[PDB]
């Protein structure tokens, strides 16, 4: 009754609402809202289960009671049976435990409301609200409202680094349900990458895709994109091309995983389409979202020095294991330029285009990456080099501060910018200490800051860590690679980094130059 958590009006963006059912379509329309404002029209259904949903893990806790409330409206003959269902997954139970929580017969032509009070089991999470009728009728909703009963530049990274670059992190579909993580990002980061949720296999749609219309979807990414847009955090798209996390069928003549490899001519179609539509859908669904960067091609250069010498950097043709289905089809890395051309053609001008890579400071590879990228920069096609920076706490050796600076500098010497895209600093299972860790973090931020304070053509425009805390890292906890412990308290790396910039220099992290 007292306090509000979700107010979805639909004025600008789809507010994290997605088609329930693979062929159900969603579209926001001007003046079909409640009170002639903007509204969310659900078309092409197929069953009473088909509909629309929104995962609201960010705002709805287990074991709290919520006022759920939606204005709906239809346009058929006679009356309609509208349902409001809350589902979840339970951290124990571990199956999608559903529940219909309000029924309401609703007549043609009229902005009727629907509601109910509901409490989820003490434990539940990854909630989710969804709207259906007992028929297969088009409908419209607006004003989704959920409620429960009951410049000062700050000591935060984004403010601290406001005059330098964006300081980012990573959300995923697990973390997007964590109270204190939400609090953390809001407090500290002004950039977010989707860990998995905007990769090809999370966004392509098999069913009725075609060589010149590749069906795509932001459903997986939606809660993330919505939370960032609503809170003015920018976003790096990640990633359009990658030998990995991309389903095989995308490469096959009959959109089967076990098909036949398609012509080049055919992949040019499928590639262009995926990119075009992928930009279309963002623009369409989340236009207020600041899409400031995108990883156009990801990790396309071999780690094998034999391949960087003779084969331009081409990975081995094939699928899985670190083989490239792209190289499989195209015979080599010609496809990189192609992809950056489509990207350039459809990306918003404010969204800068990056080649993203790891082991980016290992000489034979570094040289390869940098050659490629300079060539693209000079052609108007690339804007920046993405240094993934999966390094360790060692001040020396392979990913050591010298080899690191060397690459950084060599990249910047291209003209283009550089971003530090997926930074983590591995204690190699306790081999190094949280201090030698701190020292390395402090060193990296420091090297970025130097570049920025020098020339000038190129700049480091963002520095983002691959995860929010040590409890959510693809490297495993045992390597405590991040700035925050499993309880979100700052680690020694956090202040090492929290003190490179003097208070007289902080800024609006919500408005960073």
Ligand X SMILES: O[C@@H]1[C@@H](O)[C@H](O)OC[C@H]1O
- At closest approach, how far in Å is the CB of 22 from Ca ion? 15
Q: Which does 469 bind (CB under 5 to 8 A by kind): ligand X, Ca ion, none?
A: none
Q: Which does 358 bind (CB under 5 to 8 A by kind): Ca ion, ligand X, none?
A: ligand X
* Closer residue to ligand X, CB minimum distance, 14 or 274: 274
Q: How many residues does the chain have?
A: 513
* Closer residue to ligand X, CB minimum distance, 326 or 358: 358
Q: Which does 388 bind (CB under 5 to 8 A by kind): Ca ion, ligand X, none?
A: ligand X
- At closest approach, how far in Å is the CB of 190 from Ca ion? 20
Cα–Cα distances in angstroms (integers) from residue 300 to residues 200, 358, 389, in the given order = 15, 10, 16
Q: Where are the beta strands (DSSP E) in 149-267?
A: 166-171, 191-194, 234-237
* Closer residue to Ca ion, CB minimum distance, 9 or 269: 9
Give dist(CA 219, CA 222) in Å, integer: 5
Give dist(CA 302, CA 308) in Å, integer: 6
Sequence-distant (6+) residues with CB within 8 A of 181 are 171, 175, 468, 469, 472, 488
Give φ, ψ of 88 to 5 degrees: -160, 175
- At closest approach, how far in Å is the CB of 245 from ligand X? 7
Q: Which does 32 bind (CB under 5 to 8 A by kind): ligand X, Ca ion, none?
A: none
- At closest approach, how far in Å is the CB of 388 from ligand X? 5
- At closest approach, how far in Å is the CB of 14 from Ca ion? 8
Give yes or no for a contact between 493 and 426, defined as CB atoms under 8 angstroms apart: no
User: Mask: binding to ligand X, 302-341, rule CB under 6 A, as x and -?
Assistant: ----------------------------------------
The separation between CA 478 and the C-alpha centre of its own chain, rounded to angstroms, equals: 25
* Closer residue to ligand X, CB minimum distance, 219 or 388: 388
- At closest approach, how far in Å is the CB of 298 from ligand X? 5
- At closest approach, how far in Å is the CB of 469 from ligand X? 16
* Closer residue to ligand X, CB minimum distance, 56 or 243: 243
Q: Where are the beta strands (DSSP E) in 30-127?
A: 39-42, 51-54, 65-73, 80-86, 89-90, 100-106, 113-119, 124-125
- At closest approach, how far in Å is the CB of 441 from ligand X? 19
Of residues 46 through 65, those in contact with ligand X by CB under 6 A are: none
Q: Where are the beta strands (DSSP E) in 330-369?
A: 352-357
**426 is an interface residue for ligand X by CB under 6 A:** no
Cα–Cα–Cα angle for 177, 290, 52, rounded to 5 degrees? 50
- Identify any residues that bridge with 115 across adjacent strands, giving them in sequence order: 69
* Closer residue to ligand X, CB minimum distance, 339 or 449: 339
Side-chain-side CA neighbours of residue 466 (13 Å): 23
* Closer residue to ligand X, CB minimum distance, 389 or 452: 389
Q: Which does 50 bind (CB under 5 to 8 A by kind): ligand X, Ca ion, none?
A: none
- At closest approach, how far in Å is the CB of 35 from Ca ion? 7
**359 is an interface residue for ligand X by CB under 6 A:** no
How do beta strands 129-133 and 80-86 pair?
antiparallel
Binding site for Ca ion (CB under 5 A): 9-13, 33, 37-38, 142, 247
* Closer residue to ligand X, CB minimum distance, 162 or 176: 176
Sequence-distant (6+) residues with CB within 8 A of 157 are 167, 188, 189, 497, 498, 509
Give yes or no for a contact between 493 and 434, defined as CB atoms under 8 angstroms apart: yes
Give yes or no for a contact between 442 and 493, defined as CB atoms under 8 angstroms apart: yes
* Closer residue to ligand X, CB minimum distance, 341 or 388: 388
Cα–Cα distances in angstroms (integers) from residue 191 to residues 171, 186, 421, 467, 506, in the given order = 10, 10, 10, 12, 17
**358 is an interface residue for ligand X by CB under 6 A:** yes
Please report the DSSP string for 129-180 in residue order: EEEEESS---EEEEEEEEEE------SSHHHHTTTT-EEEEEE-TTGGG-HH
Q: Which does 9 bind (CB under 5 to 8 A by kind): ligand X, Ca ion, none?
A: Ca ion
Tell me, by CB under 6 A, how many residues bind ligand X: 7
- At closest approach, how far in Å is the CB of 14 from ligand X? 25
Side-chain-side CA neighbours of residue 292 (13 Å): 23
* Closer residue to ligand X, CB minimum distance, 181 or 262: 181
Among 298, 341, 461, 479, indicate the residue that binds ligand X (CB under 6 A).
298
Among 190, 388, 427, 472, indicate the residue that binds ligand X (CB under 6 A).
388
Of residues 433 through 492, those in contact with ligand X by CB under 6 A are: 474
Instruction: State the residues that interact with ligand X by CB under 6 A.
Output: 298-299, 356, 358, 388, 422, 474
């Amino acid at each position: 009754m007292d306090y509000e958590v979700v107010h979805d009006t639909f004025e600008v963006n789809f507010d994290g609402w997605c088609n329930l059912g693979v062929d159900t379509y969603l579209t926001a329309v001007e003046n079909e809202g409640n009170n002639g404002t903007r509204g969310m029209m659900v078309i092409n259904r197929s069953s009473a289960s088909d509909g629309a949903y929104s995962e609201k893990g960010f705002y709805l806790d287990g074991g709290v009671e919520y006022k759920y409330s939606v204005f709906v409206k239809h346009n058929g003959t006679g009356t309609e049976t509208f349902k409001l269902s809350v589902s979840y997954l339970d951290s124990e139970t571990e199956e999608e435990n559903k529940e219909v929580i309000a029924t309401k017969d609703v007549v043609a032509g009229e902005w009727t409301e629907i509601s109910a009070k509901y409490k989820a089991p003490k434990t539940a999470v990854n909630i989710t609200l969804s709207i259906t009728t007992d028929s297969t009728v088009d409908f419209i909703f607006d004003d989704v409202t959920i409620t429960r009963k009951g410049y000062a530049a700050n000591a935060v990274l984004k403010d601290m680094y406001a005059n330098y670059f964006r300081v980012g992190s990573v959300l995923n579909s697990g973390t997007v349900n964590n109270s204190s993580i939400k609090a953390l990002i809001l407090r500290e980061f002004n950039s977010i990458t989707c860990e998995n949720e905007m990769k090809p296999d999370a966004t392509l749609v098999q069913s009725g895709s075609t060589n010149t219309n590749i069906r795509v979807s932001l459903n997986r990414a939606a809660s993330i994109l919505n939370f960032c847009a609503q809170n003015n955090i920018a976003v790096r798209g990640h990633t359009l091309v990658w030998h990995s996390q991309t389903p095989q069928w995308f490469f096959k003549d009959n959109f089967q995983d076990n098909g036949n490899w398609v012509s080049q001519s055919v992949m040019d179609q499928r590639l262009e389409s995926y990119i075009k539509n992928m930009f279309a859908e963002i623009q369409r669904q989340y236009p207020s979202l600041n899409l400031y960067a995108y990883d156009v091609v990801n990790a396309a250069v071999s780690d094998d020095a034999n391949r960087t010498r003779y084969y331009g950097g081409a990975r081995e043709p094939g699928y899985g294991n670190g083989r490239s289905p792209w190289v499989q089809i195209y015979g080599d890395n010609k496809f990189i330029e192609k992809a950056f051309t489509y990207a350039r053609k459809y990306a918003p001008a404010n969204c800068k285009l990056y080649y993203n890579d790891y082991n980016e400071y290992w000489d034979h590879k570094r040289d390869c990456i940098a050659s490629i990228c300079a060539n693209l920069y000079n052609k108007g096609l690339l804007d920046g080099v993405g240094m993934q920076s999966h390094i360790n706490a060692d001040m020396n050796g392979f990913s050591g501060i010298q080899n690191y600076k060397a690459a950084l500098q060599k990249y910047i010497n291209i003209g283009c910018d550089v971003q530090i895209t997926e930074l983590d600093i591995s204690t190699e299972n306790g081999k190094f200490s949280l201090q030698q860790q701190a020292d390395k973090y402090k060193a990296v931020f420091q090297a970025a800051v130097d570049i920025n304070r020098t020339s000038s053509k190129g700049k480091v425009t963002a520095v983002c860590v691959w995860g929010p805390n040590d409890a959510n890292t693809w490297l495993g906890s045992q390597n405590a690679p991040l700035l925050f412990n499993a309880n979100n308290q700052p680690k020694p790396a956090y202040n090492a980094v929290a003190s490179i910039i003097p208070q007289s220099e902080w800024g609006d992290g919500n408005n960073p130059a």
